[PDB]
Amino acid sequence: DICRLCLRGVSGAQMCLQIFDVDSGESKVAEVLRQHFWFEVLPNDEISKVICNVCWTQVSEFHQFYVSIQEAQVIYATTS
Amino acid sequence: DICRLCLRGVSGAQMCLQIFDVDSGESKVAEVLRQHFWFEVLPNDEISKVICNVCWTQVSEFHQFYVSIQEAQVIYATTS
Ligand SMILES: [Zn+2]
Ligand SMILES: [Zn+2]
Numbered sequence: 001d002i003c004r005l006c007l008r009g010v011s012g013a014q015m016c017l018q019i020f021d022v023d024s025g026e027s028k029v030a031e032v033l034r035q036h037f038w039f040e041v042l043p044n045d046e047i048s049k050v051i052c053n054v055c056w057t058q059v060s061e062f063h064q065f066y067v068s069i070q071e072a073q074v075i076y077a078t079t080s
Numbered sequence: 081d082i083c084r085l086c087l088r089g090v091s092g093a094q095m096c097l098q099i100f101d102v103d104s105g106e107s108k109v110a111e112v113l114r115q116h117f118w119f120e121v122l123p124n125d126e127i128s129k130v131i132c133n134v135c136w137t138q139v140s141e142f143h144q145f146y147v148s149i150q151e152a153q154v155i156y157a158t159t160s
Binding site for chain 1: 116135138141150
């Protein structure tokens with residue numbers, strides 16, 4: 001198996017989150033990845049439907065930051 | 081002054097990078113911010129043309145990661 005993002009070797013699977021899990025559609029992980037990358041994340045994929053914790057930590061940390069920035073910008077734009 | 085991203089109080093300016101600097105246009109900082117956020121970063125801005133190191137560390141760390149991911153995806157998509 002391979003990490004969908006970094007495409008590096010997956011050791012087993014307990015370094016990894018499943019992007020999708022069986023009778024999939026709707027993931028949260030997929031939704032976050034779609035927000036920050038230019039390619040698509042879909043149930044099928046010849047590539048992979050797993051992401052290593054190393055990539056997920058970087059994406060989720062950035063997303064948490066990104067969400068804080070959106071909130072500050074929203075408040076500023078809606079205040080006199 | 082205020083951080084263009086988090087809109088929090090700028091202490092002085094040595095916690096901050098100038099997004100733009102005098103006879104501006106072309107920044108690298110602006111270019112990276114434009115890649116990861118939904119609003120525009122421009123010389124004028126009623127808002128601010130400075131970014132605190134706290135925000136810049138988060139953006140630049142993510143961007144470095146993002147660049148590594150693009151490279152892996154490019155190689156995969158161009159290899160048999
Ligand atoms: Zn990875
Ligand atoms: Zn900031």
